[PDB]
């Protein structure tokens, strides 16, 4: 007397058709379900009073906002000549190099992106009344902020996603609201009298967004959570995988910028961002899943999985979330192997596209910071190769900014380490970013911190070593008369310091930059075998001490070297040496005898102005032969810092 066979007699009015379904036959053909578990789950013998009492309990929308959205062609056509790589079978001979086309198969990749399996749809109070118990291979993103009094858990299969907002308030009522996204043809099974059109909020030609909660849970949530489901559903369908991920990545940085990740105010945009983080992970795994045993282009994988890695690494610092799944080891090893096919120090010599493509694999290949510290040499080479080809003091390019941002993560991840072995290359990277932070740079960024989409995302000032960026001095480089959207000017300047949370910790480990004057440093400039500390006071345990003509109002400008990064046992005794003026220099040079030096110009009223690291001959040529040196303005001095620890002041050229 086992589960063998049952007959289904349908009373089509007048016809009385009959059907049969055997449990024994198909319970073994497609295993993974037990009918008796669903039978004692649907309340077969439920009375009509209990079913209606359950129906009136779940909140039901008064309509369904219908908007026809078209979806983009995310995964490109297979490049003729690519090599199909098995995600489960990867050996160093599968690929030849970066300049070789490639694509990874979609079937083994799906088994790696959703290796973990678990019960997705729980039996909680709001969920056990609508859906059936489902248990598929899932990848979830879960976090909690206010001491576990507010939880979010967005679980997703290869075809649909479900996020769940759970806030427990004071006395113990736990208000639970959930949203479901995916194709209308693949939504989970509904239990009881519930239909989907009465529950979906936005329905496109093929996709739909459902909201499942009680009237009391929706009412209390409607006070502080009034999301824009129109634009939310439009961007979740019309945008690609990488573009949508970078979109959420930008709005996450804006939350970290002002408050947010330290004190999360339960805002409408705050909860809206948490859902879109799970959608960013979904659209990547969903686009791969919608390929019929084809292959996903490797260049597209590096372009999409780079965003998920940074997105997973930014929520681990912001909310301490947990992301299981959506991390295929075959891709992590195929990208890590691709590092031996290129040279790190010579990485900057490659094409701009190959530069950005190699840095996506640098983050995807070694996501865990510390497995390979030599990746800094590649990111430093990209920045070094970009400095020599960049017009001096000019703001960066959308392409160049994307190129340096896409590799700056391997620098930030190594900065989070307590001790690092790639010391010199980290000081070489921070020195170039310091020389790149010009007055025009923080002018376009401050202008881009209201309108530009890419400008506020990245800037070498964040990795710079400047310390004179006070709110007063940053306000002296506005984009315009400051009346053009005046409110955005003060909010952008107050936010620029908000994006100075580089090495703001929850572990106390920023001991990675010997002075007794901490909060009065103006700049640090590390050269070879000397690092100069520019400060506004005398107490710096250095091997010398120089003082330049400061302003007229008392704010002295000192700078002192430390030979070979070995500070002396005590401070200086006598008067600090005066910087000497030199005029005997040929403006037309034949060799880079200034290579390795640091040329810095400072004003007498607004403090420092520039910093120019002499890297090659092409840089020195655009320094002397240009109109950089302006000696008619007597209050604009030019201090040159040598590798011998000597400091000079260029006063004339011939």
């Amino acid at each position, epitope marked *: 007397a086992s589960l063998s066979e049952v007959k289904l007699h349908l009373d089509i009015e007048g016809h009385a058709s009959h059907y049969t379904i055997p449990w024994t036959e198909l319970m073994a053909k497609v295993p993974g379900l037990s009918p008796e578990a669903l039978w004692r789950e649907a309340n077969v013998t439920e009375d009509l009073a209990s079913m209606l009492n359950r129906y009136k309990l779940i909140y039901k929308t008064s309509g*369904t*906002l219908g908007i026809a959205l078209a979806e983009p062609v995310d995964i490109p056509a297979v490049s003729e000549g690519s090599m199909q790589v098995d995600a489960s079978k990867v050996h160093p001979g599968v690929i030849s190099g970066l300049n070789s086309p490639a694509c990874m198969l979609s079937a083994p990749l799906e088994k790696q992106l959703f290796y973990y399996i678990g019960t997705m749809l729980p039996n909680t109070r709001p969920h056990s009344y609508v859906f059936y118990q489902l248990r598929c291979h899932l990848s979830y993103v879960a976090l909690s902020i206010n001491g576990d009094k507010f939880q979010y858990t967005g679980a997703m299969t290869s075809k649909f996603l479900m996020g769940t907002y759970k806030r427990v308030t004071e006395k113990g009522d736990e208000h639970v609201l959930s949203l479901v996204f995916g194709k209308t043809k693949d939504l989970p099974d509904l239990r009881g009298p519930f239909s989907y059109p009465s529950l979906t909020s*936005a329905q496109s030609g093929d996709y739909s967004l459902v*909201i499942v909660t009680t009237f009391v849970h*929706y*009412a*209390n949530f409607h006070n502080y959570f009034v999301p*824009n*489901l129109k634009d939310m559903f439009s961007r979740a369908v019309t945008m690609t995988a990488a573009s949508y991920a970078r979109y959420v990545l930008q709005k996450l940085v804006l939350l970290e910028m002002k408050g947010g990740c330290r004190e999360p105010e339960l805002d409408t945009e705050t909860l809206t961002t948490m859902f879109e983080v799970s959608v960013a992970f979904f659209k990547v795994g969903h686009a791969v899943g919608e390929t019929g045993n084809g292959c996903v282009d490797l260049r597209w994988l590096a372009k999409s999985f780079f965003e998920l890695t940074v997105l997973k690494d930014i929520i681990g610092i912001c909310y301490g979330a947990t992301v299981k799944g959506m991390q295929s080891y075959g891709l992590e090893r195929l990208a890590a192997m691709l590092m031996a096919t290129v040279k790190m120090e010579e990485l900057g010599h490659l094409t701009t596209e190959k530069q950005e493509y190699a840095l996506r694999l640098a983050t995807v290949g070694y996501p865990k910071a510390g497995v390979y510290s030599g990746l800094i040499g590649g990111a430093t080479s990209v920045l070094l190769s970009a400095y020599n080809r960049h017009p001096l003091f000019q703001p960066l390019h959308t392409v160049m900014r994307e190129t340096l941002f896409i590799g700056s993560h391997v620098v930030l991840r190594e900065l989070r380490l307590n001790v690092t072995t790639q010391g010199p290359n980290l000081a070489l990277y921070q020195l170039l970013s310091t020389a790149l932070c010009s007055a025009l740079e923080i002018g376009e960024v401050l202008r881009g911190l209201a309108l530009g989409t890419e400008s506020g995302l990245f800037s070498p000032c964040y990795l710079s070593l400047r310390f004179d960026l006070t709110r007063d001095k940053l306000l002296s480089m506005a984009p315009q008369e400051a009346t053009l959207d005046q409110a955005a000017v003060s909010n952008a300047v107050d936010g620029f310091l908000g994006r100075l949370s580089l090495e703001r910790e929850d572990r106390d480990a920023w001991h990675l930059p010997c002075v007794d004057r901490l909060d009065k440093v103006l700049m640090i400039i590390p050269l070879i075998n000397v690092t100069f500390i520019i400060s506004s006071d005398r107490e710096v345990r250095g091997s010398a001490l120089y003082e330049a003509s400061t302003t007229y109002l008392s704010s002295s400008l000192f700078l002192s070297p430390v030979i070979m990064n070995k500070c002396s046992q005590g401070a200086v005794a006598g008067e600090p040496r005066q910087i000497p003026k030199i005029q005997n220099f040929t403006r037309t040079q034949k060799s880079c005898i200034f290579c390795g030096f640091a040329l810095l110009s400072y004003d007498e009223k607004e403090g420092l102005e520039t910093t120019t690291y002499i890297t090659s001959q092409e840089v020195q040529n655009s320094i002397l032969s240009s109109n950089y040196f302006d000696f008619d303005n007597l209050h604009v001095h030019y201090l040159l810092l040598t590798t011998n620890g000597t400091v000079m002041e260029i006063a004339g050229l011939y």
Partner: antibody
Framework: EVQLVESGGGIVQPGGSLRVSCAASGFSLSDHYMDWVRQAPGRGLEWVGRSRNKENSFTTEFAASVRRRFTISRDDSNSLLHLQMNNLKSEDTAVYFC????????????????????WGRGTLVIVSS | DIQMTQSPSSLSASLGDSVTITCRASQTMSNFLNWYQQKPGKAPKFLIYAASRLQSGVPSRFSGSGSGTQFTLTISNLQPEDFATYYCQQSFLFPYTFGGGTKVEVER
């Protein structure tokens, strides 16, 4: 200006059948919900029924006391809206109003963010034997 | 499904008075409460949606607040054209309903 002149009222015996009509002029009748609100003489308002929007494909919904009896038909090319009444009881003696419904925060979906701005002149339905 | 309880049943006030009309909700319906006025012999007139927002054209004398369970409607500088009956309506869940109605009249 938006007019909602309505007609079709009359005297009906208990259990009979009556049809009302509401004309619209001044907007697109398809892009707005249309509800009905009756009011017994001396008493207050009572929400009767609703014809949904074009985006919602013109589906109906009625209160618990009139659901199984009434029927709403929408005529669009020529602006017209009828609410056919079947099996009238003595409690349906009321002033039936034609109501236009609009949503304010539409970008948030159709949850409760609606109202009733334009009311018809009101038709009379008297159920007596 | 939700029941509306208005208070008071009757209200008397002369010109220039400041009245307040309370609307008690059955269960928690956050800010999904509208207000309408109906003069004897005419159709209802739209006054307030979302329990605090006014329809364009309604004068600044009309103003209401409240959220969740309790909702109110307050009139300042009572004008002769305000002497009518006011109703509150819930638009949260189906089937929707109105209130008992509060009748404002001239006092003496």
């Amino acid at each position: 200006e938006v007019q909602l002149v309505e007609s079709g009222g009359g005297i009906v015996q208990p259990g009979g059948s009556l049809r009302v009509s509401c004309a619209a002029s001044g907007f697109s009748l398809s892009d707005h919900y249309m509800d009905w609100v009756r009011q017994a003489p001396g008493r207050g308002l009572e929400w009767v029924g609703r014809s949904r929007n074009k985006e919602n494909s013109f589906t109906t919904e009625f209160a618990a006391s009139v659901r199984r009896r009434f029927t709403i038909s929408r005529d669009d090319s020529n602006s017209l809206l009828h609410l056919q009444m079947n099996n009238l009881k003595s409690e349906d003696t009321a002033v039936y109003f034609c109501a236009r419904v609009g949503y304010y925060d539409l970008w948030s979906g159709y949850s409760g963010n609606w109202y009733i701005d334009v009311w018809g002149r009101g038709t009379l339905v008297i159920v007596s034997s | 499904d939700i029941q509306m309880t208005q208070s008071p049943s009757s209200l008397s006030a002369s010109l220039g008075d400041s009245v307040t009309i309370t609307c008690r909700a059955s269960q928690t319906m956050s800010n999904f409460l509208n207000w309408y006025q109906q003069k004897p012999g005419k159709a209802p007139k739209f006054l307030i949606y979302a329990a605090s927002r006014l329809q364009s054209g309604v004068p600044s004398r009309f103003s209401g607040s409240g959220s969740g369970t309790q909702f109110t409607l307050t009139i300042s500088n009572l004008q002769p054209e305000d002497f009518a009956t006011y109703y509150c309506q819930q638009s949260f869940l189906f089937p929707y309903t109105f209130g008992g109605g509060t009748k404002v009249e001239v006092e003496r």
